[PDB]
Design a protein around this ligand. Structure first.
Ligand SMILES: [Zn+2]
Lengths: 356, 102, 179
RNA sequence: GGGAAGUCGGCUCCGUAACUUGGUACGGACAGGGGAAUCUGCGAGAUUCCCACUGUCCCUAUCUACUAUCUAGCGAAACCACAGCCAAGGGAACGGGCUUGGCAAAAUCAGCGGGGAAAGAA
RNA sequence: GUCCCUACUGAUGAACUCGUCGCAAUGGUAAUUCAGCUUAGUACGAGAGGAACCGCUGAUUCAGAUAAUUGGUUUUUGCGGUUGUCCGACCGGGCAGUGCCGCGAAGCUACCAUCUGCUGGAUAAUGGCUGAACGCCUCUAAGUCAGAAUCCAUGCCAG
RNA sequence: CGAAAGGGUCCUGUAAGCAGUAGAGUAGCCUUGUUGUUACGAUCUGCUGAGGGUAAGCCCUCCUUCGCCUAGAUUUC
């Protein structure tokens, strides 16, 4: 194996952390770096390729794309860090008012038996004229911090998951003075932010996730065989990975009702496969459609972040003309895009007569 | 919607389409699409018999056993007044007419 | 792009789905699934397997003579692009699809035409040969309704009413043994 | 059963007529089978592919034998000076305790591929 | 003819009230080779022949993932066929340590499938600038510029 | 939230039974049959892409049905 992914250990956290935001300069406009989503599955497409110099130039190619359910995230806080001879130090964080039950579930571990008493005194700090103290915290961030991040959480109760506990993370704000970033976050308080607002189509991003576990597995599969340098038996899988350069092909709006329709296929259909995503369900929200395979199982929490470095390739400056998106069943050898197509192909049936 | 637009492309398609609506309108004018208690109750009675046949067959399989087990004869097991009364009642007989014999 | 048809069964063959077999005589064999491919390789007749459009057309399970099927066919002579032509073609495709649906509904109705007469004849025979397994009330029920009809002044309609009630309204196996 | 390797592997007889018992001319027959397919309308049906040996190797198949984590209960033995983290140095191809350095944080579970075993010299 | 401690590899963990969000000392560290297009039948060449920098697109090996598709795998013992025997026969089934055969989702797999692999500084050989030693000269003595797949770091894994 | 059910989606490949003179065949009646009858019957066809399975690591549920539920034990500056 590679001595660069060792100490081959299970990921310390299920969420997966960014570990590096792109470097910040004040000249760029104010923007957010990262976002969150849940892996729904993957499907097949056909792209009219414009790669000047390729043998598939001006030809139709079949590609595999991963679909990420991305309900809008909610901003609930703002954290400010300072530079010290020992690194970055979180000087202070100021939250939003009216936190949601899902983020309070994130804070609690046994939510059902608990008195749900989190951040009540903080809301009283807003309401009872301790807004002087809160403004003092904002001004401390303005006048002492060098980098600002925003606290944001996902919407499980829109995601088709049995879970009810949300996911918090800090998304770094770049491109402006610290005062501009503080005002931006304070204005973003108690507001939903969308994936088409953070990213857009044609843009390569980086995906942070925890790759699927397989338990105690021997050297044959753990490293790929026929001291730390010697292949040993142990945990294989469930590993934190940051996979780079994945092209954002589409962002579907969820309420469009024609997410899977292209300018070539005039079929009013959505991204969800016929019968639903296997083991996941239906995508009823904003979704991100990106090229290739991506670390993580279905319904796993995923972090989507901007590229650290300005790109060096023509694959990152290309437009993606889509021809069609596969919506056949993933539960077996499916050959119909819609139930209407299946009915038109197979005619009417005995149960159709019995019901009608 | 699962069809090839190019396969349907045909110059001078208005004449063929108008012929299609004309022949349709004929089909309605003749009636090609014109859709057209004792039977219900006798079908229900047949369904009731079929249920009874299966419920007897299920009793048959319940006592049958798989491979040739010797069974104490009926003349040797004794059966209760309560059970004989219930079956003969379900069969529609006045049990109160006679039955102090046992 | 284009929607292909499976050689074996006739289901829509979409891009990526299936394996194509190139025979040495020069003809291509496109299948939509591994099932179809393996059936072709074991050399079975789609005209004999009942889940195939070949079999269904041979046995007359589908309509095969109609303008709604003569309107679509493979075109080997191109037509110069024309927005009105394509838009009007799309609208015609919608019209054709719904007309086809209605015609196929009528066809399958005509194929299923005589079923109720056969079912009721079978019911006649079954009831006539098994009159004894019909609902036959209950003896105590009859006695109680006789007393009730004596009270209310009729017996026949009380019967044919509470019989209907009990028929509108299962047996367990065994029972608890007293400890 | 399949794949692989090597090979030098693949692709005359009966009756008839003259001649010295045997030959000579004439007439007829000979010089396949099996399996898998494709094409035309079962059809003289037409066309395509594979048939080997080996004291060789590998894989698949069958049989034989040993193969086994935790819980409840029951329940040994081998072995045991005391111990067990490294690198350099410690004249006697000697280090495990010494010098001086790297360091070094309770209690455990599982895997195990290293160490805790070896000479005696013409 | 002499099953234990430890290293390594993973997994839990007491005390610091539980929890959420982080920082990063230190340790590890990763990409590699080839080809094709344009440059260009150009520079160069009597002829025969014939490059390269920028720019573009693929492939080998290595590494990390992933399962839309496509193969393989079947205890889905899911469905159907079929052998022997048995439940009196039909139906429906048992037994043959999963009888045999065909298809077979899901899951698992496969450079038999697909995706991704990123940028700053300082250097060595060497080539220079200014300029003494030494009234010439000199890349060196003071000072200083560039420069290798090298070195240290970022990106990346652990914490 | 759990168990059923319904719908969807996938897998297999057309259930049991009945009927049609379609039916290769197996036999009786009476006398010649130019169209004789009566029964049984492989196989075929129809009812029947039906029948069965479907999350156990598939999808959805407007009051689809039933049931459950503010617990009980320990520990903490
Ligand atoms: Zn097919």
């Amino acid at each position: 194996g590679s001595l660069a992914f060792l100490p081959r250990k299970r990921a310390a956290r299920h969420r997966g952390r960014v570990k590096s935001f792109p470097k910040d300069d004040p000249k760029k406009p104010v923007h957010l770096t990262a976002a969150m989503g849940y892996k729904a599955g993957m499907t097949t497409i056909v792209r009219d390729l414009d790669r000047p110099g390729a043998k598939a130039h001006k030809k139709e190619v079949v590609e595999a794309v991963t679909i990420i359910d991305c309900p809008p995230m909610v901003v609930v806080g703002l954290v400010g860090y300072i530079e010290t001879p020992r690194g970055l130090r979180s000087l202070t964080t100021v939250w939003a008012e009216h936190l949601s039950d899902e983020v309070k579930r994130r804070f609690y571990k046994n939510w059902y038996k608990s008195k749900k008493k989190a951040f009540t005194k903080y809301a009283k700090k807003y309401a009872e004229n301790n807004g002087a103290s809160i403004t003092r915290e904002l001004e401390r961030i303005k006048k002492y911090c060098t980098v600002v991040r925003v606290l944001a959480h996902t919407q499980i109760r829109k995601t088709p998951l049995k879970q009810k506990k949300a996911h918090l993370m800090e998304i770094q704000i770049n491109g402006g003075s610290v005062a501009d970033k503080v005002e931006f976050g304070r204005s973003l308080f108690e507001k939903p932010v969308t994936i088409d607002t953070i990213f857009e189509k044609d843009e390569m991003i980086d995906v942070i996730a925890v790759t699927k576990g397989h338990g105690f597995v021997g050297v044959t599969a753990r490293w790929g065989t026929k001291q730390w340098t010697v292949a040993r038996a142990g945990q294989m899988g469930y590993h934190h990975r940051t996979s780079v350069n994945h092209k954002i092909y589409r962002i579907g709006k969820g309420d469009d009702e024609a997410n899977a329709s292209t300018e070539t296929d005039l079929t009013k259909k959505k991204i969800t496969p016929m019968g639903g995503f296997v083991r996941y369900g239906e995508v009823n929200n904003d979704y991100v459609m990106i090229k290739g395979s991506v670390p993580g199982v279905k319904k796993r929490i995923m972090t989507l972040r901007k590229s650290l470095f300005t790109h060096t390739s023509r694959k990152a400056l290309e437009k993606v003309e889509l021809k069609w998106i596969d919506t056949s069943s993933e539960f077996g050898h499916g050959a119909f895009q819609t139930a209407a197509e299946k009915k038109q192909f197979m005619g009417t049936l005995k149960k159709d007569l019995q019901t009608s | 919607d699962g069809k090839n637009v190019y396969d349907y492309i045909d110059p001078d398609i208005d004449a063929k389409l108008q012929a299609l609506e004309e022949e349709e309108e004929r089909l309605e004018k003749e009636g090609f699409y014109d859709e057209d208690e004792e039977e219900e109750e006798i079908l229900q009675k047949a369904e009731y018999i079929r249920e009874q046949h299966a419920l007897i067959r299920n009793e048959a399989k319940m006592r049958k056993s798989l491979k040739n087990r010797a069974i104490i004869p009926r003349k040797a097991v004794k059966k209760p007044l309560s059970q004989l009364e219930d079956h003969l009642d379900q069969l529609g007989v006045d049990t109160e007419a006679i039955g102090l014999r046992a | 792009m284009r929607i292909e048809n499976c050689f074996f069964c006739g289901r829509p063959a979409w891009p990526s789905k299936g394996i194509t077999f190139m025979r040495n005589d020069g003809k291509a064999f496109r299948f939509c699934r591994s099932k179809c491919h393996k059936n072709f390789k074991m050399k079975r007749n789609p005209r004999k397997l009942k889940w195939t459009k070949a079999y269904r057309k041979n046995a007359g399970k589908e309509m095969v003579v109609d303008s709604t099927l003569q309107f679509a066919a493979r075109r080997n002579v191109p037509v110069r692009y024309n927005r009105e032509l394509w838009q009007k073609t799309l609208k015609a495709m919608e019209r054709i699809s719904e007309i086809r649906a209605r015609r196929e509904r009528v066809f399958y109705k005509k194929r299923m035409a005589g079923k109720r007469a056969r079912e009721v004849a079978a019911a006649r025979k079954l009831v006539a040969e098994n009159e004894h397994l019909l609902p036959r009330l209950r003896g105590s029920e009859k006695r109680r309704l006789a007393e009730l009809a004596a009270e209310r002044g009729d017996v026949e309609e009380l019967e044919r009413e509470e019989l209907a009630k009990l028929a509108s309204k299962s047996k367990a196996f065994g029972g608890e043994v007293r400890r």
